[PDB]
Amino acid sequence: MQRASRLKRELHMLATEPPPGITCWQDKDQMDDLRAQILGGANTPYEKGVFKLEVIIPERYPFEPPQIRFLTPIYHPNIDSAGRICLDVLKLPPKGAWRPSLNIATVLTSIQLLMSEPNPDDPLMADISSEFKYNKPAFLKNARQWTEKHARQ
Amino acid sequence: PTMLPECFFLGADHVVKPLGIKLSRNIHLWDPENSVLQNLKDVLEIDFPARAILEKSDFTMDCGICYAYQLDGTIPDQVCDNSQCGQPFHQICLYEWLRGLLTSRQSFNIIFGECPYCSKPITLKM
Amino acid sequence: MDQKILSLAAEKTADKLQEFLQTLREGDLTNLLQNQAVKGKVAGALLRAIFKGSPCSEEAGTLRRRKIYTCCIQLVESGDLQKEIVSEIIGLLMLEAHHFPGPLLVELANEFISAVREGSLVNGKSLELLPIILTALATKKENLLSGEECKKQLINTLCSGRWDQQYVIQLTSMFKDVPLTAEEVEFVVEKALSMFSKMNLQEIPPLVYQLLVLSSKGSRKSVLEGIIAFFSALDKQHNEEQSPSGELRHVEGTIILHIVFAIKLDYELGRELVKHLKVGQQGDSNNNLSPFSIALLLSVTRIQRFQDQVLDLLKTSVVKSFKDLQLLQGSKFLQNLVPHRSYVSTMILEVVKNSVHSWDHVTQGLVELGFILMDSYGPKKVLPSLSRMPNQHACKLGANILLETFKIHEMIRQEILEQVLNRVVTRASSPISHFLDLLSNIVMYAPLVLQSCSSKVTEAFDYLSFLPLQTVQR
Ligand SMILES: [Zn+2]
Ligand SMILES: [Zn+2]
């Protein structure tokens, strides 16, 4: 029931005053699911990219974190091609950090933020993480091409 | 009716105490010749707000868990013992949350845990 | 070039691979690191080859086994490789570490000591080997000085050297699994205790837990003497600062509870605690006990075995508190000599003052304690100074504790009130002035309460023909 109230508030707050470069709407195809979009960050290889996400709010939400996937392939140290995100706020604690103090808006913000500043210590793509650590240019090139291949129109 | 009713205060551990103490010391000044409001004013030594409504039309006295006012009759009553949060909750929602946590230990009819928003000690007595 | 070692291993042992070592010779870094970055499943197989390929029967297998180890320690550490590969590769480095001769493992352990000095031990998953190697050194009883002596000096060098402030706890969780002596466990934990000082508070509790589970095969006197001497200093410094409270109350408590769940399974832990907190002669009780020692005891009263023992100590000490001070305050000669250490009522009350931050276990002990004192030292001599005053004074205390307790803990003040009424009602078989005098000052401070406890006063009135008059009146 905490589901119903959370969804009602967050949906309309995200429809009228979302965080900038982020959108989140009730998936038309799946009005239990959400569709999220992250716009390609300025001064990143993800620049000129529209990254679609499937945002499922578990039935125990907000006591449990959202289950969110990238639908857009991304070249990222901490995010595999299938869209899985290595980020503590998508898991219950002591390992994760989810609580109803946080929400869809603040976690989509933490995601756009990680997209800006990858954390190499939770690597999903070891190759991408070592290339990010040693060969910034190759990573930036492959990721920007990735943006123009997958996050384009 | 004019006789003393059964009385109590919901709210902040830091807010509720001085009301209890003032009630204890003054209750003899209670007098059943007056009205209940005219007796409350002199016992609790305050005047009441009359529906402070329009100013704070989205201030969120709501659960801060379900983010709603009015859960199945229930109202956000349980608060934080903190000046910086003051974040209200439901009995229902705070029990359901705190049950899960490692940190949370249950004594007889009470649960100690961390306030969701500020992670400070908060107590729930069922 | 990975599918020219799979073939080599697929047939026979130490025939082509012991030579295949001497052929390549270049460096098992490119063959693991860059091979891992693409596909680590190879590395989990690969290592099965090299190890079967480099059997320790020969020294040119052994120094190829001593280098691959020095490599894969350093790559799992510095490397942001997956958890999943590390859960395997370490698995191997453990599974194979059993059958080594002496002087290689002391050098691997010297690498480990060097890492605890400096190295970025970003995961102590690297130190998961450090338990089993001190095992495998001890099982080889042959002079390299024997294996156990080398182990002793090795864990002395672990203790003497500086500990990574970040993961000191994780290092102390490793001596959990090794078999040790007394001296060894004592050395390691007194250093883990030197480390509480140079930490944040919120991580002291789990460290204390991992000290106690070690202390289960080691020193208990020491573990609890450390926690007590530490918090004793802490609370004294908090006091003279008042002349970080809202969390100092969480720690003291969480600790008392964590030491509870242990004395629960370890009946000897409780007995060593209790022996440590004996009065005996009253001069040990004026260096031993505390405002923290006593919250801890008055949690302990909840253990079924332990309630009684505990209380009896507190009560008997309580009296001496009155008797020292009473006999002291007769005399100036005594006041000249002793520098007056705060006395035992005070301490018990400062607990009660602390209590607010709602460690609600201590309360069962207080209430239990409180009526023990009055039921014990009540007016019945009166229906001297020696057998009178430090029993009245005791009674006063009982009363004093409960009234102050009643003021603070809204939860309890139902069953203080009933437990009073109980002793008030059927007696005047025995005197009960004291209970009514309390009963006054209870209800005087906050008599809303009896609105909540109304059934109970209703069924004190159903004895209000049999009750004698002076009682009924008051
Ligand atoms: Zn709620
Ligand atoms: Zn709070």
Swiss-Prot record, chain A:
Catalytic residue positions: C86
GO BP term (any one): protein K27-linked ubiquitination
Changes after translation: Auto-ubiquitinated. In contrast, according to another report, autoubiquitination does not affect E2 enzyme activity.
Molecular function GO labels: ATP binding; chromatin binding; ubiquitin conjugating enzyme activity; ubiquitin protein ligase binding; ubiquitin-protein transferase activity
Catalytic activity field: S-ubiquitinyl-[E1 ubiquitin-activating enzyme]-L-cysteine + [E2 ubiquitin-conjugating enzyme]-L-cysteine = [E1 ubiquitin-activating enzyme]-L-cysteine + S-ubiquitinyl-[E2 ubiquitin-conjugating enzyme]-L-cysteine
Disease: Fanconi anemia complementation group T: A disorder affecting all bone marrow elements and resulting in anemia, leukopenia and thrombopenia. It is associated with cardiac, renal and limb malformations, dermal pigmentary changes, and a predisposition to the development of malignancies. At the cellular level it is associated with hypersensitivity to DNA-damaging agents, chromosomal instability (increased chromosome breakage) and defective DNA repair.
Membership in a protein family: Belongs to the ubiquitin-conjugating enzyme family.
Protein name: Ubiquitin-conjugating enzyme E2 T
Organism: Homo sapiens (Human)
Lineage: Eukaryota, Metazoa, Chordata, Craniata, Vertebrata
Section covered of the full-length record: 1 to 153 of 197
Curated annotation (Swiss-Prot), chain B:
Phenotype when changing F8A: Impairs interaction with FANCI and FANCD2
Effect of L10A: Impairs interaction with FANCI and FANCD2
Effect of Y67A: Loss of interaction with UBE2T
Effect ascribed to mutating C63A: Abolishes ubiquitin ligase activity
Effect of W97A: Loss of interaction with UBE2T
Chain residues that bind Zn(2+) 1: C63, C66, H90, C93
Subcellular compartments: Cytoplasm; Nucleus
Positions bound to Zn(2+) 2: C80, C85, C115, C118
Mapped zinc finger ranges (RING-type): 63-119
Post-translational modification: The RING-type zinc finger domain is monoubiquitinated in the presence of UBE2T and UBE2W.
Disease: Fanconi anemia complementation group L: A disorder affecting all bone marrow elements and resulting in anemia, leukopenia and thrombopenia. It is associated with cardiac, renal and limb malformations, dermal pigmentary changes, and a predisposition to the development of malignancies. At the cellular level it is associated with hypersensitivity to DNA-damaging agents, chromosomal instability (increased chromosome breakage) and defective DNA repair.
Record comment regarding domains: The UBC-RWD region (URD) region mediates interaction with FANCI and FANCD2.
Subunit field text: Interacts with GGN. Belongs to the multisubunit FA complex composed of FANCA, FANCB, FANCC, FANCE, FANCF, FANCG, FANCL/PHF9 and FANCM. The complex is not found in FA patients. In complex with FANCF, FANCA and FANCG, but not with FANCC, nor FANCE, interacts with HES1; this interaction may be essential for the stability and nuclear localization of FA core complex proteins. Interacts with FANCI. Directly interacts (via the RING-type zinc finger) with UBE2T and UBE2W.
General function of this protein: Ubiquitin ligase protein that mediates monoubiquitination of FANCD2 in the presence of UBE2T, a key step in the DNA damage pathway. Also mediates monoubiquitination of FANCI. May stimulate the ubiquitin release from UBE2W. May be required for proper primordial germ cell proliferation in the embryonic stage, whereas it is probably not needed for spermatogonial proliferation after birth.
Protein name as catalogued: E3 ubiquitin-protein ligase FANCL
